[PDB]
Amino acid sequence: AAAAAAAAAAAAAAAAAAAAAAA
Amino acid sequence: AAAAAAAAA
Amino acid sequence: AAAAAAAAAAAAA
């Protein structure tokens, strides 16, 4: 469960980085 | 990635 | 699954 959560967190971070690049 | 976001804020 | 979740989140936003 913890691992899954971590993965999710990682995924969210990647999405944020992509948004910044677009701006 | 998370660290970079914090710096921007 | 993770990808799906992400997509869902995006949709929600």
Measured at the CA of A19, the angle between CA B3 and CA A21, to 5 degrees, comes to 85
Resolution in A: 4.4
Write out the H or E segment, with its range, that includes residue C3: helix C2-12
CA distance A4 to chain C (A): 8
Contact between chains at A20 and B1 (C-beta distance less than 8 A): no
3-state secondary structure of B9: coil
Contact A17, B4 (CB under 8 A): yes
Residue A1 is given by DSSP the state -
Nearest to A11 by CA among C11, B6, C7, C12: C7
Nearest to A17 by CA among C3, B6, C8: B6
Residue B1 is given by DSSP the state -
Contact between chains at C9 and A12 (C-beta distance less than 8 A): yes
Alpha-helical regions (H) of chain A: 2-22
User: What residue has token string 């980085």?
Assistant: A17
Nearest CA in chain A to B8: A20
Contact B5, A13 (CB under 8 A): yes
Contact B5, A16 (CB under 8 A): yes
